[PDB]
Design an enzyme around this catalytic site. Structure first.
Site, PDB file in Angstrom:
ATOM      1  N   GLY A  22     -15.172   1.828 -11.287  1.00 24.60           N
ATOM      2  CA  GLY A  22     -16.330   2.714 -11.324  1.00 24.60           C
ATOM      3  C   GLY A  22     -16.993   2.816  -9.959  1.00 24.60           C
ATOM      4  O   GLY A  22     -16.339   2.640  -8.920  1.00 24.60           O
ATOM      5  N   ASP A 129      -2.814  -7.282  -4.357  1.00 24.60           N
ATOM      6  CA  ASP A 129      -2.883  -5.853  -3.962  1.00 24.60           C
ATOM      7  C   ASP A 129      -3.269  -5.685  -2.511  1.00 24.60           C
ATOM      8  O   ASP A 129      -4.110  -4.847  -2.152  1.00 24.60           O
ATOM      9  CB  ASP A 129      -3.856  -5.031  -4.802  1.00 24.60           C
ATOM     10  CG  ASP A 129      -3.609  -5.181  -6.207  1.00 24.60           C
ATOM     11  OD1 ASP A 129      -4.014  -6.239  -6.730  1.00 24.60           O
ATOM     12  OD2 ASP A 129      -2.949  -4.271  -6.766  1.00 24.60           O
ATOM     13  N   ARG A 133      -5.992  -0.103   1.968  1.00 25.05           N
ATOM     14  CA  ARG A 133      -7.075   0.384   1.105  1.00 25.05           C
ATOM     15  C   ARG A 133      -7.988  -0.748   0.651  1.00 25.05           C
ATOM     16  O   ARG A 133      -9.141  -0.478   0.306  1.00 25.05           O
ATOM     17  CB  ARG A 133      -6.527   1.123  -0.115  1.00 25.05           C
ATOM     18  CG  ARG A 133      -5.652   0.235  -0.985  1.00 25.05           C
ATOM     19  CD  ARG A 133      -5.156   0.947  -2.241  1.00 25.05           C
ATOM     20  NE  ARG A 133      -4.232   0.045  -2.917  1.00 25.05           N
ATOM     21  CZ  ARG A 133      -2.951  -0.073  -2.586  1.00 25.05           C
ATOM     22  NH1 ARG A 133      -2.412   0.671  -1.628  1.00 25.05           N
ATOM     23  NH2 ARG A 133      -2.202  -0.988  -3.196  1.00 25.05           N
ATOM     24  N   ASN A 134      -7.498  -1.998   0.650  1.00 29.27           N
ATOM     25  CA  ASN A 134      -8.317  -3.162   0.308  1.00 29.27           C
ATOM     26  C   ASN A 134      -8.667  -4.008   1.525  1.00 29.27           C
ATOM     27  O   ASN A 134      -8.798  -5.230   1.412  1.00 29.27           O
ATOM     28  CB  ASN A 134      -7.605  -4.005  -0.748  1.00 29.27           C
ATOM     29  CG  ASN A 134      -7.536  -3.288  -2.075  1.00 29.27           C
ATOM     30  OD1 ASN A 134      -8.532  -2.702  -2.510  1.00 29.27           O
ATOM     31  ND2 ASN A 134      -6.376  -3.314  -2.726  1.00 29.27           N
ATOM     32  N   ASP A 147     -11.481  -7.744  -2.272  1.00 26.03           N
ATOM     33  CA  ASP A 147     -11.088  -7.618  -3.671  1.00 26.03           C
ATOM     34  C   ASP A 147      -9.793  -8.340  -3.978  1.00 26.03           C
ATOM     35  O   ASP A 147      -9.040  -7.931  -4.864  1.00 26.03           O
ATOM     36  CB  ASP A 147     -11.066  -6.145  -4.118  1.00 26.03           C
ATOM     37  CG  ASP A 147     -12.490  -5.528  -4.121  1.00 26.03           C
ATOM     38  OD1 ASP A 147     -13.444  -6.298  -4.295  1.00 26.03           O
ATOM     39  OD2 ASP A 147     -12.667  -4.315  -3.903  1.00 26.03           O
TER      40      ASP A 147
END
Ligand SMILES: CC(C)OC1CN(C(=O)N[C@@H]2CCCCc3cc(-c4ccnc(Nc5cnn(C)c5)n4)ccc32)C1
Length: 255
Positions: A22, A129, A133-134, A147
């Site tokens: 979210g 992951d 992007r992380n 994350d």
């Protein structure tokens, strides 16, 4: 609890974007300290499992990891409070051509991430992951890993996955190593999609055929050797993050 933040201590100021759980917002804790606040959408997370792991994640303290400050659990949506990174996602950062990056700066980004990952490996903690992007960028241009572990609680990174993951779901320290090599490729390619002309399905077939990403133009031969060492077919022939960090430091000295 020591992992628990009072949500009344938060001042919400700006919306940063929307991820797998979210919306994420920028705000202040107790009027003073910058934080990022994930607002966990109902139904998106295995919340009780995450809450128990958050106790472990709080104790992961390394200067190159985006720190988890605490969680707000007494209400729904629950909130995850983290360190705020003023310059946003590394992927977007790399794609902004105005930076005119020097390759020394790209290698420093790799070193930042490698240090974070050597710390996680020392704690036997997988990211699961790892990808540009992380990773996030702070106001000093330092890259930090974000994350880590969180994908365990999501109710797939084909292009960051080694063959034994794509064929057998064999996850290990060496699948983080593989992903790190791909991240190093993202960095030196200024944010290109790995295997950019392929779909995920075609990438998996390519990887099973033994083929590999090839050298980004900005990578020296020694830098390419480092990322390529992450992609050995046999997981046990891939380096550890301790060895990769040594390799990266050596190249920084040689320039
Ligand atoms: C690993 C997977 C399974 O799950 C994870 C949960 N997840 C997830 O929430 N991602 C979103 C991606 C979209 C954008 C929203 C955002 C923001 C931040 C964040 C954190 C600290 N600082 C800043 N600063 C800053 C400045 N400008 N912008 C634009 C941002 N931003 C972290 C993550 C995410 C992927």
């Amino acid at each position: 609890g020591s992992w628990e933040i009072d949500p009344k201590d938060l001042t919400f100021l700006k919306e940063l974007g929307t991820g797998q759980f979210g919306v994420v917002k920028y705000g202040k804790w107790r009027g003073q300290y910058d934080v990022a606040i994930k607002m966990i959408k109902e139904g998106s997370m295995s919340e009780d499992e995450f809450i128990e792991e958050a106790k472990v994640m709080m104790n992961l303290s390394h200067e190159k990891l985006v720190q988890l400050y605490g969680v707000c659990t007494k209400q729904r949506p629950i909130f995850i409070i983290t360190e705020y990174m003023a310059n946003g996602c590394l992927l977007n950062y790399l794609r902004e051509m105005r930076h005119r990056f020097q390759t020394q700066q790209l290698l420093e980004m790799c070193k930042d991430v490698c240090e974070a990952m050597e710390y996680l490996e020392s704690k036997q903690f997988l990211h699961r992951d790892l990808a540009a992007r992380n990773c996030l960028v702070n106001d000093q241009g330092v890259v930090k890993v974000s994350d880590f572990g969180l994908s365990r609680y999501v109710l797939f990174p084909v292009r960051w996955s080694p063959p034994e993951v794509l064929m057998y779901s064999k996850f290990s320290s060496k699948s983080d190593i593989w992903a790190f090599g791909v991240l190093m490729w993202e960095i030196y390619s200024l944010g290109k999609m790995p295997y950019e002309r392929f779909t995920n399905s075609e990438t998996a077939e390519h990887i099973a055929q033994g083929l590999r990403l090839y050298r980004p133009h900005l990578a020296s031969e020694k830098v390419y050797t480092i990322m390529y060492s992450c992609w050995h077919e046999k997981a046990d022939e891939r380096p550890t993050f301790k060895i990769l960090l040594s390799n990266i430091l050596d190249v920084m000295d040689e320039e």
